[PDB]
């Protein structure tokens, strides 16, 4: 006969289970003399209320934002994160158990839109074997042909979720060239725009690349041309980050790096073979700086 694990088998192994009925220790039933009336087999559903089931006829309770009668008032987060009908009791009155009467109505599930009927989509297998930094982890999982941009030349739709990274340096691997035009003379009043563009050129020269001098170029415009940056990608497409008043070199780097990620995604969708990111001497120097910071604090 087939054998299975049992309490006697576990005892012979050397482990005894806890006593359920016959034991001189507490049986953990706080409702035996506290909860009155009908009690449900779900354990501890009324302990946060104060171990009682009184005063249930109340409708409105004391509640913070997102609880109770907050639905009638506007809050930026909850107005998009909570349905105005899913507001329940707040505080210690959280509904761990709810019982109602009537015929239950189960609304139909939402339907995926902008999907033509009879379309066989491509399925992308996402696994942890693929590094998280690869755009394939951010690419769509159920990708249809009606979502692929063919005018750009893509074989697959573009990624819908972008990485959340504060970029402090530039990565010039997916960038054919960077031209930075500045004015030779220095403005009389403190020109934060000029300072930020000069800092951007400095960080682009110090960017992460085997030789960023081959891709970074500086130009002077005696025609009083406003300082500007022009990044030409590998496919020839050009991006011009608008340098407005108040923007810093870190902001310009963040913009350029986000657009570089988007451009590399477009390349990969078009079919372009891109060189991957890996460990290099720049990363070793950043490790030196990281160890310095760790030793400091």
């Amino acid at each position: 006969p087939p054998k299975h694990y049992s309490v006697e088998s576990l005892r012979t192994v050397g482990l005894l289970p806890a006593q359920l009925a016959l034991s001189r220790k507490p049986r953990l039933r706080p409702h035996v003399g506290n909860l009155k009336g009908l009690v449900y087999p779900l354990p501890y559903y009324a302990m946060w209320r104060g171990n009682h089931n009184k005063y249930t006829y109340n409708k409105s309770t004391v509640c913070l934002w997102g609880e109770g009668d907050t639905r009638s008032m506007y809050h930026q987060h909850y107005a998009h994160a909570k349905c105005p009908t899913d507001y329940g009791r707040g505080g210690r009155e959280f509904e761990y158990l709810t019982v109602k009467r009537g015929k239950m109505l189960q609304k139909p599930l939402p339907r995926v839109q902008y999907v033509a009927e009879g379309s066989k989509p491509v399925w992308l297998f996402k696994s942890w074997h693929t590094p998280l930094s690869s755009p394939s982890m951010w690419e769509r999982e159920v990708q249809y042909a009606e979502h692929t941009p063919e005018h750009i030349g893509a074989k697959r739709p573009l990624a819908v979720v972008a990485p959340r990274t504060m970029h402090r340096y530039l990565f010039l691997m997916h960038m054919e060239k960077v031209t930075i035009t500045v004015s030779p003379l220095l403005f009389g009043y403190g020109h934060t725009i000029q300072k930020a563009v000069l800092d951007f050129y400095r960080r682009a020269i110090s960017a992460r690349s085997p030789f960023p001098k081959d891709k970074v170029f500086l130009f002077y415009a005696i025609d009083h041309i406003t300082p500007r940056i022009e990044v030409t990608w590998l496919d020839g497409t050009s991006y011009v980050p608008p340098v407005l008043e108040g923007a810093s070199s870190q902001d310009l780097i963040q913009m350029v790096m986000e657009e570089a990620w988007l451009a590399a995604d477009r390349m990969a969708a078009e079919g372009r073979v891109l060189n991957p990111l890996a460990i290099d001497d720049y990363k070793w120097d950043q490790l030196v700086v990281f160890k310095k910071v760790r030793d400091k604090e």
Binding site: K59, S60, T61, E93
Partner: protein
Amino acid sequence: EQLPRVAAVAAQYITGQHRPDFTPGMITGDHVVIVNIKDVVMVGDQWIRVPITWQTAYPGGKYRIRLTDMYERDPCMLMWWFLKDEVNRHFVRKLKTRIAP
């Protein structure tokens, strides 16, 4: 509207003081249907800072709760408590004059 103000205004009509023929021995008051108790206001942090206290016939049986706790249990008990105070302000001696309004 503020809870003590609402209680005072309601007690004025409930006890019959709003009538020119008011006689303290005669209990004749108008009925007042108070709605939207859940939307009554309380200025400042008084919802947390104003207590409701009462003791039982036992030693150590003294309850000190907050208006927040009273509202969480039953928001109408707050209005009933403040109306009771406004009534006992003038009719605390006898029991009929206390309870009938």
